[PDB]
Amino acid sequence: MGLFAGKGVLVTGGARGIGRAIAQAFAREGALVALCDLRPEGKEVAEAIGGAFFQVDLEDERERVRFVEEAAYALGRVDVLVNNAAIAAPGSALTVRLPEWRRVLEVNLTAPMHLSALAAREMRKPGPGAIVNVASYLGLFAEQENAAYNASKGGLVNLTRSLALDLAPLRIRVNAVAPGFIATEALLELIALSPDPERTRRDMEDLHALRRLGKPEEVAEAVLFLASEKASFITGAILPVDGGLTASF
Amino acid sequence: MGLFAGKGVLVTGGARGIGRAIAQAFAREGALVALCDLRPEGKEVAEAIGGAFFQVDLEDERERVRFVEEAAYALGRVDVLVNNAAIAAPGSALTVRLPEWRRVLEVNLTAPMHLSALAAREMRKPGPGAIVNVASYLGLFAEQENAAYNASKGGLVNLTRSLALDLAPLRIRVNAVAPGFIATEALLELIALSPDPERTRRDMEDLHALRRLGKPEEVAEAVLFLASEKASFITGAILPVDGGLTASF
Amino acid sequence: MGLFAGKGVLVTGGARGIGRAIAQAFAREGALVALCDLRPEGKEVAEAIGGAFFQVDLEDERERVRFVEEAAYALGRVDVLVNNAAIAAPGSALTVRLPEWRRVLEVNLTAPMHLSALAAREMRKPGPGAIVNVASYLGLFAEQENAAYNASKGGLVNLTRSLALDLAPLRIRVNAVAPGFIATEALLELIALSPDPERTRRDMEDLHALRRLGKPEEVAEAVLFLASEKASFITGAILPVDGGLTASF
Amino acid sequence: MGLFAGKGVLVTGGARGIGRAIAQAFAREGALVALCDLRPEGKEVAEAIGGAFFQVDLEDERERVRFVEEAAYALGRVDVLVNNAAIAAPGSALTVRLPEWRRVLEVNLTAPMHLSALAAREMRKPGPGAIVNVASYLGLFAEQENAAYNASKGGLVNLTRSLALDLAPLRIRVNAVAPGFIATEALLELIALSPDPERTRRDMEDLHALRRLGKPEEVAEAVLFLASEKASFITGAILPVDGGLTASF
Known part of the structure; x- marks a missing residue:
């Protein structure tokens, strides 16, 4: 019935963009998809692919414990987590407000760490697990007037390596994609x-x-590959999906 | 009948190891595989998978023109090249002999550039093309007493980026895998x-x-992914296949 | 006289280790050094080099505004900031407590951003300014059971690049060192x-x-170089001071 | 007397540009500078700084053995080598001629390896030694129509790491600078x-x-720093001198 047949897949920020494309891609390969989002329109994405929706604010550590327990219940197992949800706060260090900065770090960096720990405890049960973090070329480099996003994605890249070391004993692989535009x-x-x-x-x-x-679909293909058993010797890796953006100037 | 159905796939160093595993993986997905090697035993690998063998010494620029012309003829088209063949010459800069150094650069760095140029001219004809270069963690770092290999793989990594820029206009993607042990x-x-x-x-x-x-099979899976249209927005990328080797100390 | 003669230099975590060695190095080159630390023994380091001490908790955004205003007052100008102070919270993502994680991010990543913004507003007045962030090889790689430090240093590395872009128009250079052990x-x-x-x-x-x-002195030499006008075309750089640690495995 | 007082310093491509600026910088700090170049105007640079000139074609392995022996004789000791001389061959892999490519590799990659081995044998005698390789941002990335330079600089970067591991036992530090424009x-x-x-x-x-x-002088400052005992815990490092070029897009 496909590559992720009967596997439980959690996807954050699944209502639109790359998140929607990832939820769709996993469903197409026969995954039981649980997706969360702030936006209530997430309901119609889950309906459309035959998966579960959860309205979650990833800024809230209680809402994150909630999301994983309810998703694990709904799907009956957890095999894959995708940390895709991210926010930004416009401005340099000169112009950004501290509470805005702190919010971006909570969602983009703290939430993925938290969720990986929660999902990891569920992945222990059956055979092997996999986590894929959606970063950005803006985790390996900077752009002007985007300090919070640059800092949080830099953190996400090194958190991916940290999680790869720490969770290998539990038979969990952890990788990131770094999309271009x-x-x-x-x-x-x-x-x-x-x-x-x-x-x-x-x-x-x-x-x-x-x-x-790029097309959201093209990012999702990379995510499926890295979450799949085809990638069984790939952990700790940061895979650019940027049509050559970071190979030149 | 499969992911590379009716596609012409060239693979260097195809007689044993990762090369053999790559030739096998492409054939399994319905590729017309042409593989070359110094070793005459390559014959039995091609027979076994229903592909073409060519006894080639990649050190020789004439033997490289020969390999691509004959392979293109045998398969009737060229869609994918894999630069997998490599040699080493033990020694630091202090202990290595210049002719040994020059030979390693010719095979590991000059041959992949040459072959990419030859194969690219054949890829123009039908739909899109792809090249995958097999480096090593020893292109992104060094080990003791292996100067020629470290230098040539460093070159191969940046050649991958150069070929990605230069061949994008011909609808050709170029990526590398960097295997661990x-x-x-x-x-x-x-x-x-x-x-x-x-x-x-x-x-x-x-x-x-x-x-x-790692298993040779696990490197081949990465190669198939990167050569496939699933990777349609991945070019210029160096993908580690090292089970977390380069993520830690 | 000397290389930093009459220049105002702020140094965080100046009581012991790399921080003390940095404060000593700047003073030796004729800098007006303001150093902060939680440890009261910081007093004796400032006395010994003819500079100012401030007992500061960098976790507190008000204590950070305080430190920069009072230091600028005490020295009469600000030319250089060194973000050296850092904490850790032992544990993987499995074992670390959220409030501990959030505290490490505040000190290691938020405080350097905040302080760079505060110090930048003072650097406008005279000629050019410079910021040097003390990271670690553990910003570019991971170790077991140290998720908060790995993540925060990953962030610090990409924050260094962000600050370099954003502050270049104000004639402010921003670089990091990545020390080994x-x-x-x-x-x-x-x-x-x-x-x-x-x-x-x-x-x-x-x-x-x-x-x-490594010796704390050897890290300080790199910091002095990067803060100096000898480094006038170096900004956005992460400079390893690791005796070859990150060049191999 | 200065920072390189009575030290023997070899510099390739010393007639113009970065090479001239490096030879001038070392002499200013009291170095006995031997510089080589194809261009006979190199004579006037050596005269001007009170050092030795040698007309050398680095493509020739005999002319390279010659240069090191005669320089060691002229100065009475060797403490520092700078591999600065480099050529390019315009063209993609499609458009570049093989003999042109092979020449670029010989000068840009083989010559620095050879010269490092020759100079290392002289550095054994006194206390510690240092090698600095002048790469380019075009060793860490690619540009269009410059395959030979991209590949050779990629190799130079990983050769720097290889030489750092191999020569650390002989108390020789090896680093590179990667200049911008x-x-x-x-x-x-x-x-x-x-x-x-x-x-x-x-x-x-x-x-x-x-x-x-950038100014040639600003690259030379980095070279002096990396060759100096101030950099005593820096080996294997690639230091960008690019005014933030490689920190963004």
């Missing part, structure tokens, strides 16, 4: 509202060796 | 002939988060 | 309390190409 | 001969956080 609704809104939308999109495309935006 | 015949011979074979193997295992050697 | 009092306490102290120290030494522990 | 005569000629010279220079400047070209 992906044509999600949010990036299309940003381009659309720029002064010269076509010039903006051309400038973004030109940064990639492949001279085009 | 893989239980090939050669590594098992080395362990077996060490004074305390079990102590040697335990020390090698202990360097990896997964506390075991 | 340094023979500070804290590391000597850890060795001393291990079951076989000499076996522990030999194992640590053997991980470095130089087969010895 | 440096305003040498050659880069200024290239800008000057472009259609819109100011637009060309602005685009180059805009790639660096500091939004300006």
